[model samples]
Target chain A: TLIILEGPDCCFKSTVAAKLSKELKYPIIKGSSFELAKSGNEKLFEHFNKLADEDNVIIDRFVYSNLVYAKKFKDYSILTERQLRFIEDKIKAKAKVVYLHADPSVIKKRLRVRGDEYIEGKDIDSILELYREVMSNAGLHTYSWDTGQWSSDEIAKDIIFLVELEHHHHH
Target chain B: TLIILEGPDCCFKSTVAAKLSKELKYPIIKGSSFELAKSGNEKLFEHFNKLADEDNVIIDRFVYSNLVYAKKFKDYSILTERQLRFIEDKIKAKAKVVYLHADPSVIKKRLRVRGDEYDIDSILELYREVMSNAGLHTYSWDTGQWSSDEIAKDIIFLVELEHHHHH
Candidate 1:
């Protein structure tokens, strides 16, 4: 089973993912962003091509990151249907997507305090919104959580409780 | 645990799926060749969707078949990406894909002896192409390299490695 944590910057993804990784005893794979895969010649996407084998894991940023960022930065993703299907086939089939969200204000505050490159302050709100839409449409078994005023430790525990509940309910 | 066996005709998908199911004591749910998901879509998916969270379960074929077949039968395919995604998501809640493929000559021989007009080579290629991208815990289990029992043993080994013990 693959557990992928996705959201905009400062959504507590890393915190929750780290907790889940340690708690679940599942290794965390930091999925690469900026990647395609259709023609036999998608050397750019090859790195992720091998990720299909790493199923028993917690992913820091996986396909949804690429999907959201590519859609945001570029008009449409350059990935071919073959490419998307390949990844989504594994992803949609094996992953439980945890879509973590933090308010734009929280994101903005965190970005500045944390000091970062690549993610501009102005883009936080839009990036968060885009990430939401992509998960909504991406059609994985998504559980959305807001990193509210509660502590990161609580949020991690809550997320685990939610997943466990889902397991019993569905099982 | 959704263990899906995806491959083309004559790939021993059914045989392998059955062996794994019985050997592992996982209940078997054989997918249809037709669109069992036509009407009351969610209701249809609910059958298998509910099983994924269990200790272990084996699926003969699932969303990948829908994807590949739909592409081949484009106009006739009422299945859209949205619908496909929904189906894929449900079963994959916590699952793995095992894609079976065989030696070219073996598939070539199997293709020539039976089935309809579709190009077996092309169809096989299409399956590989589409499945390679699923990017999950997908195994391109080579039917070409081992016997059915051997394949089952190999897959069982993976279960020991990857299964979280349902604890």
Candidate 2:
């Protein structure tokens, strides 16, 4: 199974993904390679497929990031809605989605503490709306977490339990 | 068959690709969508596959451009060498590569005329070296040899002939 931890900047996807990998004892495939390759390199999804076949995988970010960011920036989509569906039908059947969300206040506090002054300047409320819409439309087997309140241990353990529940269902 | 027209800035790939599209009567998949979407967009390639299955596709720019530009600008590559090979083996079997070459003097003239004064090429030699090394099936076309229409017709005819042979 392939699992993705997805969220906006300062949403703690990295921290959560890292902790989830440790708790679940799975390998992490950093999302940067897919990000860099998604535009020009046509074979990236297939590469991800190959990796996923060999092991249960944890992705730091995935498709929703591309959709949200492109829509937020008002740029051409990297993946069309039709294309996104093709990818989901083919590669996402065995995948699980974990969406980490935080309250705007918490996000603002974290962005300030982390000195992500660039992202802090943007209209985050609207971006979050777009993100939520895209993720909901994707219809993946998903678990949403309000990371604003949970500790890393609690979140990681909860995700592990969900994954195990899914695994038994598969068997 | 899928054919790609590739080169550096001011190398006339857009001109050649447009003329080729008209001459060949093939649908053109402009590279801009891919360029804008490449970072973090995972499904674009599959879209290209669907299009190519239905029609002969000509790309304005593709993987080699990604590799060359990233190398020239000192940036990270979008595709690893291994990943590039994976794509070639899977999707690029029917692909023909067309590389456009220009004299530095011609390139400089075009750059000046276009007012794209930022494209200084002190590494022209190195860039050409990389282009030559990267392309194995590539047929080189000189931009200075013919008018745009003539070049398009000539390249189109050559590619058609090659496709027939492969068939």
Candidate 3:
């Protein structure tokens, strides 16, 4: 199962991911804008390729969502049918996708609480709008969540339920 | 999980995928060989880049494997890193792969059953060799079955196992 948690920098993606890993007793796979930019390669992507080959992966922010993220950030833009064909192959290749959703207002608050100067002056409304747009456009298999009222336990349960339901297919 | 069932044309990938999908109730998203061929762009590489954004893909022949296959058959040079990077980004962008395995005897029998003229002569042997090369040179998530239920189970377990486990 590939779990993708994408949003503005401040949402509790990291915290929630940490919690889920601890609860589920699985290794945490993390995606970073910093690494891809510096290394000029998605190390995690390579990892995913191998795991998909071996059939042992719990990818976080694996490959699919990153492309949408890339598109939103304008790092790349060259949609082609052959490429879509290739993408179609990859999508059918996977088991299921886990998408994480966070409310922009809450994300904004979290950002401010973190006390980052860059995020401190961020335009909250625009960031919120952008987050919605990015997730919407990606059209991935996902689970939506708003950090409000939903305890980590409850969220983990939701995730586990999905995972459990999906497990039988592999048999 | 999508299954590649990759090998010679007649290893029964289509049949396996169909059965798996029906049994598991997951959609069988085929890696369209015909569509990819028809949509041949000089920027086929670029097209691959764009397509990487999608989840649950089953490429009939992924780029790395193709490169290896090409090298084994023709006297072509290995693909450049830049070329590889373009494809890698998409693969990384959408992390999923499945290799379909087949023994020589089994493949021959299936090839005759399917009766595609394209599978004649040394083609089957070449295909097997190329695919083996691909498996060795590059990493992949593999499924070792031609059965619908087995394939379906592989796909399902792939999702369960690999999910949240990306590099």
Candidate 4:
């Protein structure tokens, strides 16, 4: 399966993903350090998907994270409709998306340590709200959780169970 | 192992490869991005031979870049197919070419951004067709698709992979 764990900074994507990745021995490809291309970037999506099909991989963050940030910063979706649908079609059956979140106080404490430029410390709640909007509308096989309340170790265990549950049984 | 970077102006080939040069501390030799001279005589093959066979150096614009640009701008190469094929074999003995690519529209946008003068619009289309059609590059990438740093990182990764294999 193509697994991607996404969240705002310090939402514990790496830690949680590490656990899931090892549980399946999945290789993780980190998100690119660039703005999402609205066009002329189709091969990159295919390249990521190629890795997904050839290996059941995990991604640190992918399209959803890009959408969340671009929408947050630029007040733009940052991908054409064709681009969005292209992603949806590429990994329709293979992708399992997890939208990880944390409580504001928890995020605030982390931000004090992290001190980022792209994610304004004051804009935490608004960013969280944007992820919520993007996730609810995504129309993919998705899971959501509050990493604030639970340790990543426990969450990773629960994640494996849920994806397995859907794949093997579901009813 | 030789690494060469090629593309149209403003496609980030030079900038990205230069980063690999500084960080890796590999000497980057720049081929003329614009035509330096159209040769009619001898000693040119000697010039190309010594340049192509250099080991562990990063070339900013080498043979594939030269071949395509000449084909595009001049409407035919000063050096013919057999001449290019001969250079290709010499370079293939030690070099890996990285062809940085981007759509003409994106290149056109970048051209305006840099406001670099002295003829770029035609070469933009040339890279998309003639350069890509040349097809001697070991790897081709869309510079528009990823950032310069990431592309630089991937090139380092390629160099590392080849190094381990060499040993």
Candidates in order, interface RMSD in Å: 20.4, 16.1, 21.6, 20.1
Error of 3 at B102 (Å): 60
Q: After superposition, how far is residue B39 of candidate 4 from its true place, in Å?
A: 60
DockQ agreement of candidate 1 with the native complex:
0.01
Best by lDDT: 4
Q: Is the docking of candidate 2 incorrect, acceptable, medium or high quality?
A: incorrect
RMSD for each of the candidates: 24.3, 18.0, 23.7, 17.9
DockQ (C-alpha based) per candidate is 0.01, 0.01, 0.01, 0.01
DockQ, prediction 4: 0.01
Query: For each candidate, how many residue pairs have backbone atoms clashing (under 3 Å)?
Result: 5, 3, 49, 0
Q: For each model in turn, which proportion of the native inter-chain contacts is also found?
A: 0.00, 0.00, 0.00, 0.00
Error of 2 at B117 (Å): 30
The order by descending lDDT is 4, 1, 2, 3
Q: List candidate 4 segments past 4 Å from native.
A: A35-55, A72-77, A115-121, B1-167
Question: Over 4 Å off in model 1, which ranges?
Answer: A34-41, A72-78, A116-121, A162-171, B1-167
- Could you give candidate 2's per-residue lDDT for residues A95-160 as a string of tens digits? 778888888788888766754333433367766777788878875667788878887678888878
* TM-score for each candidate, following the candidate numbering: 0.43, 0.46, 0.39, 0.45
- lDDT of each structure? 0.66, 0.63, 0.49, 0.67
Q: Score candidate 4 by lDDT.
A: 0.67
Model 3: lDDT of residue A142? 50
- Mind giving the per-residue lDDT tens digits that candidate 2 earns over B27-81? 7886523333334324444434454454377887666665555433211234566
Candidate 4: tens digits of C-alpha lDDT, residues A60-138: 8777766775643321235555666677777777778888898877888786655322234446776788788888878
